[PDB]
């Protein structure tokens, strides 16, 4: 058991949910129809894919996901798709007028109608489950659903299933991609009234995603498929440890233990190597000491920010394929020694490792070549507040002449709602000041 | 004069694996519970460890537990795994999450009755029970938490038995989380009051013997096991062995506890040796004796020149001169008096047994009890306060119910524990 329920919110979270589900299934063997050969446990079993897959008495392997958005348009395309037969149709869930960009619409206005539908699906599911431990939350910051529907969703799973473990996936935006000019104000208003109700949520900033395609993988303007892809490989290494068994496997709650000091302070960051062409790979291994020397080069961030100006708290190797405890050691002594890494003065130096031995899997079609050893790094840096700082100074242009706020108010918001979490934000900010300061 | 054994939590179990794997061999016991042995002296006290089963079997007097089922499969899937009472598996679903406080106040409280129901089966079978010996780490959330929970409940109903426990202590070098020194202090403060003699298996010094010493590269938990199996197998010598001696848990405790808190034992080893690979010149009396002895085979990351030696208990395993075991006994006492207290006199007791372990014709084990244990606690001491001073980690324990002022108690009590040994090292 310890079943994982994965949750994918607008038009970025169902999207890369596609990506990510579909990278799983290669992962593991299973079809598009849902039928896993190598499984002989038909219709159960405890086996570690089955945190992500139930399995019914025909031997269909079901994603626990479901599928939400406030318009229809993405998740049609997931109905009548290449793995359509995978899910459930009950696990796709769509209204008909989106959130218009607004997060009170996603909140408020069109998320209430439906927010009941939703957690009545998530409650099949998790009735399914023997030791439910918690749920994976996929959107973005800057759509209306992503922003606001999530936010009223993950209220509403605190109240239904208490402290159950809730982490997130969450797309920051970048203007080479964002489709609204109202995305800061979503940001702001979605992290501050989740902030509570997540233990431990993955930025992907993506313009760093956007940058990652362009420099590495020779792709002239990525599309969202070209960032997904990506990104459902970092997705994938962060859960790799719980759906694939090992010896030297860590389980995620292990990680979190060391990457969450005090509740606020739970946004790590992910770094992720090697993102190689195929034409680049060719005659050309990457060993462990260069894939892990990467993870320490700031144009591999899922976040944009510079570790070398900050503090860290926590630092967290996740490898996958062919690699031993002795290469990884070796690699990081001689990190240690050239490298800029300097802890905060109240928490512990060492790395903590994990490795699963299955290695990376690639979508037929992509751009990553197919390597023999990958590793994502989670650190704890107070460099991912540069991030907020970023937002949060976009938000302050904007707010301070009021531009556009009588859309969110139209819709039933105060501006009490925005200095609310405007002020959280800035408080948020200097949490993260204090932790980097020496103790006394 | 029967002991209840007790391994909770992952690494409990695992270095309880091994133990009874170890000491089975010893005294012929295979997988299935037969003996096929060659001498004697291995049934004459096989009860104090062993209940016999119809069909002359014999069933170790071990109680497995975990609130996670993983380690404890793999128990049962290894080598020694069939020869458990498979009624004495006692584990629940949701593991500890390296957390004592879910261990010893939320998720641990929900098993620990069964687990006394199980202890007290075994003990109304038991002729005259001597006490208690646990196997657990103090890092982790279930053998630290739980355990300690357990031990509380174990002194409560049996107030008159002896409790023992092997007690592994958490290092940086070999660390799965960072809150190891919390769930370790926290778990000092309950072995300080509740048990009569724990066995201090210091990761630090596994590590440093496994990679200075036997020139292992990368070690694991299963080269730092094997020091532990053979520390377990000869500090239990003189329970399982008919000598001169006939030891018992409470004979030990009293001989070698001049205060009720200094309860707290440096274990040794010599030859010390890698899994696998075996050396074919046996050691001479007087090698063992100086290895024994040496810092670098401590099991407890401690000079011993930096503090003093209260009690000492040793035992000889192998055919070798009696005479000149005494002899050399009596050589390192006489040349190095100023490390044993003159307040108490011939506080070095040595045994003999002709049984070796598995693959030595010779070895020594040491039992110290030293001031220089202080060292431990202190280090323990600097990584809780570090962490301490500014709240960090806590949430994960104030989500469980616990209060700050619980955590202050504890760093409080060791920090006196540390005094007191300080105390004795200057007179
Ligand atoms: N990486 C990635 N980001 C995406 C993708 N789709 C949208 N985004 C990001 O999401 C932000 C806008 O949020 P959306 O998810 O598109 O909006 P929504 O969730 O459908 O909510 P509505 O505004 O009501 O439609 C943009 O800034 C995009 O950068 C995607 O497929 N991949
Ligand atoms: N020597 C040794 N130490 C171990 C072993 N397994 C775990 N540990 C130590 O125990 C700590 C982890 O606690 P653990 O027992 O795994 O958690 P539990 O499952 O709740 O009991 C770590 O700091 C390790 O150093 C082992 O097999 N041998
Ligand atoms: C300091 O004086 C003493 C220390 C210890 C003991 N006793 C009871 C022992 N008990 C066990 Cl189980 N093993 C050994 C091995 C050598 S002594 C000993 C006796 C006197
Ligand atoms: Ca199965
Ligand atoms: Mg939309
Ligand atoms: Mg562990």
């Known amino acids: 058991m310890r079943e994982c329920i994965s949750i994918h919110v607008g038009q970025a979270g169902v999207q890369i949910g596609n990506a990510?589900?579909?990278?799983?299934?290669?992962?593991?063997?299973?079809?598009?129809?849902?039928?896993?050969?190598?499984?002989?446990?038909?219709?159960?079993?405890?086996?570690?894919?089955?945190?992500?897959?139930?399995?019914?008495?025909?031997?269909?392997?079901?994603?626990?996901?479901?599928?939400?958005?406030?318009?229809?348009?993405?998740?049609?395309?997931?109905?009548?798709?290449?793995?359509?037969?995978?899910?459930?149709?009950?696990?796709?869930?769509?209204?008909?007028?989106?959130?218009?960009?607004?997060?009170?619409?996603?909140?408020?206005?069109?998320?209430?109608?439906?927010?009941?539908?939703?957690?009545?699906?998530?409650?099949?599911?998790?009735?399914?489950?023997?030791?439910?431990?918690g749920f994976l939350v996929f959107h973005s910051f800057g759509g209306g659903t992503g922003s606001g529907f999530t936010s009223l969703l993950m209220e509403r799973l605190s109240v239904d299933y208490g402290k159950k473990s809730k982490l997130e996936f969450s797309i920051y935006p970048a203007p080479q991609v964002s489709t609204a000019v109202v995305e800061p104000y979503n940001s702001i208003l979605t992290t501050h009234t989740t902030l509570e109700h997540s233990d431990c949520a993955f930025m992907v900033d993506n313009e760093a995603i956007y940058d990652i395609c362009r420099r590495n993988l020779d792709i002239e303007r990525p599309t969202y498929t070209n960032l997904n892809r990506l990104i459902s490989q970092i997705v994938s290494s962060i859960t790799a440890s719980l759906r694939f068994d090992g010896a030297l496997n860590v389980d995620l709650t292990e990680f979190q233990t060391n990457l969450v000091p005090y509740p606020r302070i739970h946004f790590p960051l992910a770094t992720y190597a090697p993102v190689i062409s195929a034409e680049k790979a060719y005659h050309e291994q990457l060993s462990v000491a260069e894939i892990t020397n990467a993870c320490f080069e700031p144009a591999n961030q899922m976040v944009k920010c510079d570790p070398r100006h900050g503090k860290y708290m926590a630092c967290c190797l996740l490898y996958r394929g062919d690699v031993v405890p002795k290469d990884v050691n070796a690699a990081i002594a001689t990190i240690k020694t050239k490298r800029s890494i300097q802890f905060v003065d109240w928490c512990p130096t060492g790395f903590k490792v994990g490795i699963n031995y299955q290695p990376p899997t690639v979508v037929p079609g992509g751009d990553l070549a197919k390597v023999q050893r990958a590793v994502c790094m989670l650190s704890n840096t107070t460099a991912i507040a540069e991030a907020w700082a970023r937002l949060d100074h976009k938000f302050d242009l904007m707010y301070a002449k009021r531009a556009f706020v009588h859309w969110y108010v139209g819709e039933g918001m105060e501006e009490g709602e925005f200095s609310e979490a405007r002020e959280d934000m800035a408080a948020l900010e200097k949490d993260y000041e204090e932790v980097g300061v020496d103790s006394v | 004069r029967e002991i209840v054994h007790i391994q909770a939590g992952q690494c409990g179990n695992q270095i309880g694996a091994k133990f009874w794997e170890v000491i089975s061999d010893e005294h012929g016991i295979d997988p299935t519970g037969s003996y096929h042995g060659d001498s004697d002296l291995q049934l004459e006290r096989i009860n104090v460890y062993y209940n016999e089963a119809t069909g002359n079997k014999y069933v170790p007097r071990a109680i497995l537990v975990d609130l996670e089922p993983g380690t404890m499969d793999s128990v049962r899937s290894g080598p020694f795994g069939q020869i458990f009472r498979p009624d004495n598996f006692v584990f629940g679903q949701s593991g500890a999450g390296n957390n004592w406080a879910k261990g010893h106040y939320t998720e641990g409280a929900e098993l620990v009755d069964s687990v006394l129901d199980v202890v007290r089966k075994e003990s109304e079978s038991c002729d005259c029970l001597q006490g208690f010996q646990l196997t657990h780490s103090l890092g982790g959330g279930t053998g630290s938490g739980m355990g300690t929970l357990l031990i509380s409940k174990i002194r409560e109903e049996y107030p008159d038995r002896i409790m023992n426990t092997f007690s592994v202590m958490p290092s940086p070098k070999?660390?799965?989380?960072?809150?190891?020194?919390?769930?370790?202090?926290?778990?000092?403060?309950?072995?300080?009051?509740?048990?009569?003699?724990?066995?201090?298996?210091?990761?630090?010094?596994?590590?440093?013997?496994?990679?200075?010493?036997?020139?292992?590269?990368?070690?694991?938990?299963?080269?730092?096991?094997?020091?532990?199996?053979?520390?377990?197998?000869?500090?239990?010598?003189?329970?399982?062995?008919?000598?001169?001696?006939?030891?018992?848990?409470?004979?030990?405790?009293?001989?070698?506890?001049?205060?009720?808190?200094?309860?707290?034992?440096?274990?040794?080893?010599?030859?010390?040796?890698?899994?696998?690979?075996?050396?074919?010149?046996?050691?001479?009396?007087?090698?063992?004796?100086?290895?024994?002895?040496?810092?670098?085979?401590?099991?407890?990351?401690?000079?011993?020149?930096?503090?003093?030696?209260?009690?000492?208990?040793?035992?000889?395993?192998?055919?070798?001169?009696?005479?000149?075991?005494?002899?050399?006994?009596?050589?390192?006492?006489?040349?190095?008096?100023?490390?044993?207290?003159?307040?108490?006199?011939?506080?070095?007791?040595?045994?003999?047994?002709?049984?070796?372990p598995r693959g030595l014709k010779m070895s020594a084990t040491f039992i110290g009890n030293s001031t220089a244990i202080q060292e431990l606690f202190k280090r323990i001491s600097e990584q809780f306060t570090a962490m301490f001073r500014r709240k960090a980690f806590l949430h994960w324990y104030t989500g469980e119910g616990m209060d700050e002022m619980e955590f202050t108690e504890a760093e409080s009590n060791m920090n006196d524990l540390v005094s007191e040994y300080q105390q004795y090292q200057d007179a």
């Not at chain 1, 992500?52 to 009548?80: M, N, Q």
């Not at chain 1, 218009?100 to 439906?114: C, D, Q, S, V």
């Not at chain 2, 005479?323 to 007791?349: A, C, G, H, R, T």
């Open chain 2, 174 to 356: 070999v660390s799965d989380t960072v809150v190891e020194p919390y769930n370790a202090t926290l778990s000092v403060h309950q072995l300080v009051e509740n048990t009569d003699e724990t066995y201090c298996i210091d990761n630090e010094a596994l590590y440093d013997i496994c990679f200075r010493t036997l020139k292992l590269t990368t070690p694991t938990y299963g080269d730092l096991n094997h020091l532990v199996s053979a520390t377990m197998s000869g500090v239990t010598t003189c329970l399982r062995f008919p000598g001169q001696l006939n030891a018992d848990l409470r004979k030990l405790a009293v001989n070698m506890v001049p205060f009720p808190r200094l309860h707290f034992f440096m274990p040794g080893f010599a030859p010390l040796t890698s899994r696998g690979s075996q050396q074919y010149r046996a050691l001479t009396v007087p090698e063992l004796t100086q290895q024994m002895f040496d810092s670098k085979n401590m099991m407890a990351a401690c000079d011993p020149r930096h503090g003093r030696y209260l009690t000492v208990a040793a035992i000889f395993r192998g055919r070798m001169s009696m005479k000149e075991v005494d002899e050399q006994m009596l050589n390192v006492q006489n040349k190095n008096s100023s490390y044993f207290v003159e307040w108490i006199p011939n506080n070095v007791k040595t045994a003999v047994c002709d049984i070796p």
């Open chain 1, 20 to 133: 990510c589900w579909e990278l799983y299934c290669l992962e593991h063997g299973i079809q598009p129809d849902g039928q896993m050969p190598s499984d002989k446990t038909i219709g159960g079993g405890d086996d570690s894919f089955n945190t992500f897959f139930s399995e019914t008495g025909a031997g269909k392997h079901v994603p626990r996901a479901v599928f939400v958005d406030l318009e229809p348009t993405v998740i049609d395309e997931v109905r009548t798709g290449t793995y359509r037969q995978l899910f459930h149709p009950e696990q796709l869930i769509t209204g008909k007028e989106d959130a218009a960009n607004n997060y009170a619409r996603g909140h408020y206005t069109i998320g209430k109608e439906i927010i009941d539908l939703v957690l009545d699906r998530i409650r099949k599911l998790a009735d399914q489950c023997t030791g439910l431990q």
